[PDB]
Structure formats: structure tokens, C-alpha cells
Homo-oligomer: A and B are copies of this chain.
Amino acid sequence: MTEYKLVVVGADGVGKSALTIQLIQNHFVDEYDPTIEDSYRKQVVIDGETCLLDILDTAGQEEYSAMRDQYMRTGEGFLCVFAINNTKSFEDIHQYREQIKRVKDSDDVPMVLVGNKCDLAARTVESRQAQDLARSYGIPYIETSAKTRQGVEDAFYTLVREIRQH
């Protein structure tokens, strides 16, 4: 079967594991346990296509930055995640984009920009600036909430659709 190797990349604390655990185990994780690298495989049917989602949950911590070049080489699509209440994570999203581009030696890499934690009333990054950023990148912009499960299948499935049209 078709396997899709989807990498979740993003600063420390933005909710990566929390988007992968909602999708994989339908539970929101309230705790914070920092990831080094975690792999999840799930057979799913997306748009009638039976397939296997191989998902890598990576680290936000700059200690682990070294390993970035190894998983960007093997990933076919990247969820680039920032938290709507954290402007630095939003700015950091460019440090991943550039790095992914550079180890994959291409400008068009399948990617989705994900503004997570959209359940938070106290937002510092507005939709508008993240849409203009996704518009500049040429990728879809999806708001998500790992806690309400809002926008979660949507993000990962739109990523699958970006890899399919590439």
C-alpha cells in the first residue's frame, strides 16, 4: 500500500505531539513530556484510498537540532506548526521551512502551515498574518486545536493531498 511519511516539525511547546496523539489515539494530552523523536504508523482510508500514515513526531528543543537533517531527508510532507499565542513559534516556522528546502534541494516541498491551540482566547498571531505567510509560501494554512480536535484530521489529510498532487 501507499505509505505517506509525514513529518511534524515546530518549536518547543506548540502542540505537535498533541496533534499526533489526537489523530492517532483520539485523546487530548494535557501533560508536557518533551519528545526526542517518535514514530506512529496507522492504516487509514483517505478519499477512498487505503494507505498508511507513517508519522514522525520530532523535537522542538534546539539540543536535538542535529537530527533535523536526517528526518527532513526522508519525509515526503511536513506539517509546520506554531501556536497562536506564541509569536516566536510563528517566526521560527521560517527556520524549518528553509532547512527543509535545503536538505531536499527544492523549493516546492509538500507542507502545511498549522496554527495550533486555536482554542485559546488570548491570541498573539492573527489569521491574517499566518495566511499571508502561507500565501507567500504557496501552501495551505489550517488552524487547529489539539484540545477540541478542531482542524486536526483536516491538517493531516490536506497534507496527504499536497503529497498526492506533487
Known: A154-B154, A158-B158. A165 touches B48 (CB 8 A): no
Complex Cα distance A98/B142, Å?
30
Given known A135-B164, A164-B131, A165-B140, contact A48–B118 (CB-CB < 8 A): yes
> With an 8 A cutoff between CB atoms, is A64 at the interface?
no
Contacts of A57 in B (CB 8 A): none
Nearest B residue to A165 via CB reads B135
Across the interface, do A48 and B115 meet the contact criterion of CB distance under 8 Å? yes
Q: Mark A128-166, 1 if CB is under 8 A from B, else 0.
A: 101100110010111100000001011001100100110
Residue in B138, B142, B161 whose CB lies within 8 Å of A47: B142
Total contacting residues, chain A, CB less than 8 A: 27
A155 to chain B, nearest CB (A): 10
Interface flag for A126 (CB, 8 Å):
yes
A47 touches B164 (CB 8 A): no
Chain A contact residues, CB within 8 Å of chain B: 47-49, 84, 115, 118, 123, 126-128, 130-131, 134-135, 138, 140-143, 151, 153-154, 157-158, 161, 164-165
